[PDB]
Amino acid sequence: RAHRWPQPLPGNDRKIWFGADYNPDQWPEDVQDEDIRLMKQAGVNIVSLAIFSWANIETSDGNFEFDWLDRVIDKLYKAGIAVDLASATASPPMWLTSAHPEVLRRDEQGHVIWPGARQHWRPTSPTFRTYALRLCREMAEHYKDNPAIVSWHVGNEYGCHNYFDYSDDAVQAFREWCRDRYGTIDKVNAAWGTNFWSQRLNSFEEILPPRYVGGEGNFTNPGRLLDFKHFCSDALKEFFCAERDVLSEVTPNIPLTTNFMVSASQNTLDYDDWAHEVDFVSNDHYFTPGSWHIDELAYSASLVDGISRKKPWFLMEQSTSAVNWREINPRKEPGELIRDSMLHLAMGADAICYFQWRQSRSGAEKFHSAMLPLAGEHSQIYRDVCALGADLDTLSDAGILRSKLSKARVAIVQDIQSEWATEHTATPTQHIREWTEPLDWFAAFANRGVTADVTPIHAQWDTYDAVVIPCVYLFSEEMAERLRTFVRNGGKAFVTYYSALADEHDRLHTEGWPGLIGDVVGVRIEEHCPLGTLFPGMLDHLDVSNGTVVHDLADVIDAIADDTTVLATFEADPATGMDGRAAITVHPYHEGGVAYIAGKLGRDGISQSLPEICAALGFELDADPRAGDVLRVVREQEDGAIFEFLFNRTRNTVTADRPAGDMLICSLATDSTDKVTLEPNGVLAFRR
Amino acid sequence: AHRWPQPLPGNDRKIWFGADYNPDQWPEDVQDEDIRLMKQAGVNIVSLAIFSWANIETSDGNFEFDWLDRVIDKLYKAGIAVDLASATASPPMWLTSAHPEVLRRDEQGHVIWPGARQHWRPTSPTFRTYALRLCREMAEHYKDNPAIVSWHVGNEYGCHNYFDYSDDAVQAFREWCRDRYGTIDKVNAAWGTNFWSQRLNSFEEILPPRYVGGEGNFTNPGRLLDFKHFCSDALKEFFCAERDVLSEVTPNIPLTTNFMVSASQNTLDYDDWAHEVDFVSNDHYFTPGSWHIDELAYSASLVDGISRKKPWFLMEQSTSAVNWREINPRKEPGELIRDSMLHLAMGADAICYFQWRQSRSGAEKFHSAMLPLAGEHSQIYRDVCALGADLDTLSDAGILRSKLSKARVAIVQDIQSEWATEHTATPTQHIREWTEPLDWFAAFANRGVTADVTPIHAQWDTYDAVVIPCVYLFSEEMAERLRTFVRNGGKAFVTYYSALADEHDRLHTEGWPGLIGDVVGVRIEEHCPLGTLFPGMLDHLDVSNGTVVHDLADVIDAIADDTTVLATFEADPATGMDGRAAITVHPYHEGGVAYIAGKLGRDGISQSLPEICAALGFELDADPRAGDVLRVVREQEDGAIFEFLFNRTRNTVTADRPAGDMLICSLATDSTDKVTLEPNGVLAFRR
């Protein structure tokens, strides 16, 4: 679609948007003036409202009431505050689920999903779609050409709860999805391997979604499962498009977005694909507690930018402190509030918003942090939040808008479909999923002072000096060609275990692994060597000769090309048949460029190997560990203005080479004329 | 309205001592040996027919009493009283087969089938009909039979069937809400149903909290709280109906039902049920390991608490192993007698076991009894006979109707707060209310102080000191009670996770503790949960006095000017916790408030207690030995004092001898100077 960013309200300029989900309909209206006074003081200029306000709008069937929403929207507009307005179709009222219990989702075992939480609806319910499009229309009509509304928030995190439906509506939809994608039943049969275990289909009507097949010790069809995960994503996407189609039909000036859930571990929605149906990309992200906090946020924001194809994106949600939804919910430390928002910013967001504005007293999210805590305006959270708005106006005025995150030296390929494939319960080990490997390489590259671009698989990683292929389990013929070309012409590639095992339908490649691509990699593998502690005396690690250690899984490399060089070998009990086998290799292919990594090494084993491997490939690398102490993230204007952010990645005070330019921002950090000083959780930004 | 069961025609008053008794599982030719062996053991009551429904109403509407008459006659002739059940605990196969609509449904709509017990819907009109009929039939048939000294109505209501989601549950829960709230808006307002489009147009839209999709999903916290309240109230209404039918036909016979008070029990509101029984009776089974002693003393204290210090009846406990855990350990030598003495010392006037004769078959076949499968030549039967003897001695020494003395400190227990801390969207699933009171009780025991565990509506505000441990719900009134208690000179220990929400689970605003910050002197803007969920997570916080907080800590932002800080957190500065306040004490008029800003554990509390108490002005022996023996004291109106001493340790201990006559000793040695207890020993004196 074409890129349409939300624009300012009639009269004032373009700013970094800074706001929050806002839910006045959970408080007495008399609170709305205080809300707005405190927003202004904070630097807040947009809020998103009505996201789950369905049952306070269509108060009963066919009956729409807009007064309370009309009143508060008026107060916000008069205050200079924009409205990112929802469809309010995210979750239905009790009256509707009562009259039509047929809209309720069904899990793999046919359990009914009742109301009492949210999103208890079947994505492909014809009835739910009807009520829903009606509300979308009603809303669009009523706020047509109301000028406070600068954009639409259609629904809410589609599929967060209702990805997997197994109801009769879903059965019907998965059938037709399969007909539309495969054409003939023979082709479905051939993609799924249905001659195995007498699963062969006589017709499209015989096809079932992968409902319960009896638990542990039972193994559902993997190809059918892969496709079903694909269908689920597309079913929700289709629903979204029908809703957006209705909203811009009535108010075509207003750009539409929906809020994604990009994080290192998200493993449902195919968001690179969804991104093709939004005027701008916006994301919800919540910090991962502990050591992974920083690298995993950077990773996710980088990825978002990747899906955005380096266009500006909108951080719709993140948290000021604790979430509510983990089994343990830690608070943020001093500085992390500001520093996290800065990271999202540095990775290309032109907007920064939280869930939520005012902490709820009751309901299931009552313990989720907000900008204004229950403790009230005399709280450290609110003080930090005010500081943030202030820094975001500063950045706006220095002119950062619409600058793009710069092109890294190395692309790290992330691939959701591979993630799905690696999820089957009959793989060589359940201890290996695709999602962790890209994250480790990103963390490892941060350790050596190189900030990578996380890039989805259909993006242009083949225009980078180097790419990481980390457990890209599905390799199609085309994917194989793309990598072969990238390497022929001087590309340098890092390829790992669990890469290129199967075609795109989860049919394993023959003649040895990596499949399709073995000529380029220079390595041949006849089987895996999974490792663990399931049973007493099991082989549970493999030492590597460079002083690292592999866990969970290793490849058994049988032969290498004559021009393949071994950098590292496994060191083990000879009887294991792994002693002296190749663990890390590098192999020339024309002008490039391939290192193969035959096991899971983790952030730190990757990171400790990285120097010897980069040297072998001709990738310049700082070999000093200090090099990773600060993470440097850069945005570039076409006019040549450069915004460089520095972040302490460690738990001790650090000193960095000061960039040239003007200091725009500082949190837990000290500028000097020579060198720059950051405390833990501290951030700096300069314009050059 | 306290009615204790009385002796049979002719007998004197004795500590009751018996067991569940189930002759309907054996050939009648075994009964004379049962009774014989009972007499040798000192047994003077049995409870029978508790699950004998299918052997009484053998088929629909057919009631048969001959076997029960025969055995009750042998028992009567032998001098053994009968605590007779309604036998309505669990229905026959013919009933559930004819009427499968009585069957419970779990949150996912699963039928709960027969094959175990208590598979019934609490609010099944059909089942209620059958049960109340049987109740009547029993009552009719044993009207004015002098063998029957009491009624055992049903059995452990809600042990299995607390949570029903059937249509009967759906309907009753509506009506329960209609009645508790009046108008649908008061509901909407209690539950915060404007969040996530939950707002209700009517009562007919209210549903019980059935499955909303497992992990990653979060049901309405107020609706869940109230549903837990409802589940307890539904079973209670049912019990009252059963007892009403019984006491109407035989009004002279006192009625009870058996509770399951233990540290971690978390369903029935028992303090609330205690209002519908003629005497309070409890089932308790030991917690294996270290916690064996303190967790029994705590549970028994709490039952007395619920009884408002009136005598209570230990209906069930075990001689050795239970059957129902994943590992079922046996009791060690001495624990059988010592355990019964702990319950006695905490105010019980009856001591009975599950069960009399170990079963050869059925699901409880490996559950221990008084007469083991090994037979009469067993260590368990030998100890039982000794216990029987000890209890006759104590009856003769005049212990009956003595009350447990008023301790210096009350420890507040609150089932409704436990229900609240159970919701899956709290700061951490690692914190529940129940553990904390238990830690403080154990902690005082470590310092030679025996506390009274008290439910929230009991009179803790008449003690020198009260403990408020994870009392997450504070109503306005609760807040006023505490304020008054401290103003008028009471001293209070308050912890983290206290006073977060009103009674509807709605968070207090303006900072925590809510409502009560004027009295506590501390202001908290958010929590700092700790754990190991993810690598590098903050998983503990040292405290400056040498203890350690785990699981959860409060972030104390400000303290009142007259607040004194006793200990601070010590952390990595980047955490924003280093040097923060961890234990504080604060004057409020004539009391009296110490704040403990995290989970310390038994040992952390115990190690801090001296300093806290000194600052509060509560005398405390600073020596660790002080907790080597637990002293529990019962007092007669006439001035008689019964003092029991118990070894809490695993090595021999020596204590000051009480004055008076020595009544009982197990694994212990009276001397004229000082007393000697072995591991697991108990001693008793009258003074």
Ligand SMILES: OC[C@H]1O[C@@H](O)[C@H](O)[C@@H](O)[C@H]1O
């Ligand atoms: O952390 C909680 C938040 O998670 C967001 O992704 C969701 O869209 C918000 O409504 C809120 O639920």
Ligand SMILES: OC[C@H]1O[C@@H](O)[C@H](O)[C@@H](O)[C@H]1O
């Ligand atoms: O410990 C085993 C016992 O548990 C009791 O609570 C129950 O009422 C008895 O019948 C038996 O099941």
Ligand SMILES: [Zn+2]
């Ligand atoms: Zn089920």
